[PDB]
Amino acid sequence: NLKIVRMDRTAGCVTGGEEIILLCDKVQKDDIQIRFYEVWEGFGDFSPTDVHRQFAICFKTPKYKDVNITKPASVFVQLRRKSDLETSEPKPFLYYPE
Amino acid sequence: NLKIVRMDRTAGCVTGGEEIILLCDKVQKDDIQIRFYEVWEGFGDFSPTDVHRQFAICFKTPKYKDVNITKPASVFVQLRRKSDLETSEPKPFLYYPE
């Protein structure tokens, strides 16, 4: 089962598109997503080639639901397997205004 | 043989101590170093537990040789095996003034 071991950033701008490196326990590159949620949900933008040897993922943050927030919005991020929707424990993530 | 596949930062402040995540091809956690060089050399600060499943390394940058530079200093970074001193191809890295 799924685990986010580390992320180099736990915050990002509401506009999205910012690169993060996430370290995970073993995943399958074609059966993995990164889900940001609050239910609002957005997905990390990456392809299977951005999964590094099943143990890391380089991705770009999704745009948050509201790019006009005036203060930070606390969300969660989890790994999720596409096939059976199994998830990791969530990590907090802070979206901040532009 | 050794390869730096990606680093989340390719620059840092001369004072060192900044966290980087490096993605690499397979290493042994007890037989790996990260060497910054220009011969001046400094080493990434990490322990074997900071090596993630042999495919990534979380480390802190070394302090540069001169913390009083007034413009950026271009150095190289390589993986190096401690046992036999085998190295990866170098990646450029820019140190910048405080």
From Swiss-Prot, chains A, B:
Where does the UniProt annotation locate this protein? Nucleus; Cytoplasm
Q: Phosphoserine occurs at which residues?
A: S83
Glycyl lysine isopeptide (Lys-Gly) (interchain with G-Cter in SUMO2) cross-link position in this chain?
A: K71
Q: What does this protein do?
A: Constitutes the active form, which associates with RELA/p65 to form the NF-kappa-B p65-p50 complex to form a transcription factor. Together with RELA/p65, binds to the kappa-B consensus sequence 5'-GGRNNYYCC-3', located in the enhancer region of genes involved in immune response and acute phase reactions.
Please identify the protein, giving its name as recorded: Nuclear factor NF-kappa-B p50 subunit
Q: Which residues of the full protein are shown?
A: 247 to 350 of 971
